[PDB]
């Protein structure tokens, strides 16, 4: 456990002293091959070699070997360049990236232009893959310079190991880039270069990481139009329907900082991003449930998002993956709600409260006898006085859940002229006011004679922007 | 003097590695803990990010005031005077004003990629870099750049929550003065050897504006709708089309349909020798006479240019 470090430290001390001593061509590459072979032997220990490899990379950093690699990447030869590059590919851990981001940027960026041999490119793609995981500043310095161009040119190749590093580099750049980095990637059409990486029938991990990069680019609202025009979203949904997370749980762990990146994939109301997030959180929930670290999903809060995915599902694949992810954890799976909300009695409202996280007020609704018709017509004052929900923040969380409910609702028992589809064609956040306008006796043939006070007092539209938009639309297109 | 809280603000609000490293080293040489950089996706925050933000900016006493109320980032971006005063136990207006100063500093440094459709935060920053704090005020009301010419002052006061009338007048004036204004190429391929080549052809043709389709109800109508035709000849592409008189292969159906149309067939040869006409059906022998284009992996751009020069 600790004696492997005692075996591997003085050997790397002698090897780095030999690398400092040698200044030729073949001896330097032989020393780099010896260091790289010792690092490869350090990778392959069962549940031991992780901390051992981290300690050996820290010892290489403290011996000044990182600056030695930065000087050997400036060497005018070709062989010792690819051995130093393949060694620097495996040395890069969570503590070396700061020292490489301070100094080493510009040297690796220079090798990003030299693209013709495969032995350079397969490792420089992995070095850029590691360097996109540092911060947003390093992502800006790589994308604004010729670092993104290297990956977008190397997506053309057929190397099954290089394209994995390219897909992971684009995914980690989309995760840790920001706004302008994603704008510069999609204006340079980085989502279109992921089409051979999401369709290649030789590797499936490569297609999964390509679909991850496509989904993370598709979680930005100013980006989704050109991603839908690219056509790489349509390969996401069958592929996730074709694979199994229990097989890919061994190849795919990550820390909690990367576990925080998979949660807004589910709360970004896109089908492909929710499928990718459900598949990855199911596989990594199998990972964290094999061990005893299931508190991380409750700390970050993906469990309530998976419950929302189960209770608000229109797709069988993401619902099955969310049910499997909640089954691999230590809580019960919820049931899909009945969409006919005006047809709800009391027990459906109680089940809805038990599923969305309002259990404490369950006995607050049973004594008051609230069904779906009273749930669709509930205001501030009845929550505050009659229901014992005195906190306005708790009331606002209840109105957010009521927005999520009245978006996903079947109004077939009350809507005469299909008003919900018109409200959705205006803006998909307007359908929550459908019950506001159907219960007042309105249809498509009357909205040209409705004022603002009738939308405020009777229909209950509290936002004046939405009132102005509904009045303008009802006077411009429903006047005939 | 109070430089420690400023160094904590420098760590928690950093976009530069140098000043953040110097502030972390300065807080490490002192006798307190260094903070972590916050996650910029504030509408993607759950409760623990809000708790960490409170522990970093100096609002520890109200941490248990936000955990019982279950405040996430979406409730943090939408918090007012009355909910601070009544629900959260922050009775002092000076403490509320310090919280709104920290909320100004937070909503300046925020990632709105999960909600902003038309890039409103950059417009608000181009007006004045203290306006981006109202970005969540205007995105959550359903507004974008194409609607702000029909917004009044009451909609900015009540709905958007802009309390300063100077900022309301500037936003209204700016919004009224500057914001007032069938496929073509079908690709046939073998689904076991010519998938990556067909995908790469589709990408390099959609880079030049060509509407390219990929993958008897839909495929024959896709051949009928496409103006051109590109055949991928992988090693083993015409293997299942040999002695296929019973019309079983999909590539057989696509080649027979394309020769029944009369479209511009451009074959793409990637290490595949030319087959014989007698092992193929007669109606698909005419593909053996078209001028094909070889594929070069090192010179792909000139090959795609040669493909574009042989199309409509």
Swiss-Prot record, chain A:
Homooctamer; forms an octameric ring via SAM domains. Interacts with TICAM1/TRIF and thereby interferes with TICAM1/TRIF function. Interacts with MAPK10/JNK3 and SDC2 (via cytoplasmic domain). GO terms for biological process: cell differentiation; innate immune response; modification of postsynaptic structure; NAD catabolic process; negative regulation of MyD88-independent toll-like receptor signaling pathway; nervous system development; nervous system process; protein localization to mitochondrion. This is NAD(+) hydrolase SARM1. Phosphorylation at Ser-480 by JNK kinases (MAPK8, MAPK9 and /or MAPK10) enhance the NAD(+) hydrolase (NADase) activity. Phosphorylation at Ser-480 and subsequent activation takes place in response to oxidative stress conditions and inhibits mitochondrial respiration. The chain holds residues 61 to 548 of 724 of the full protein. One of its GO terms (cellular component) is axon. It is an enzyme of class 3 (hydrolase). The lineage of its organism: Eukaryota, Metazoa, Chordata, Craniata, Vertebrata. It comes from Homo sapiens (Human). It is found in: Cytoplasm; Cell projection, Axon; Cell projection, Dendrite; Synapse.
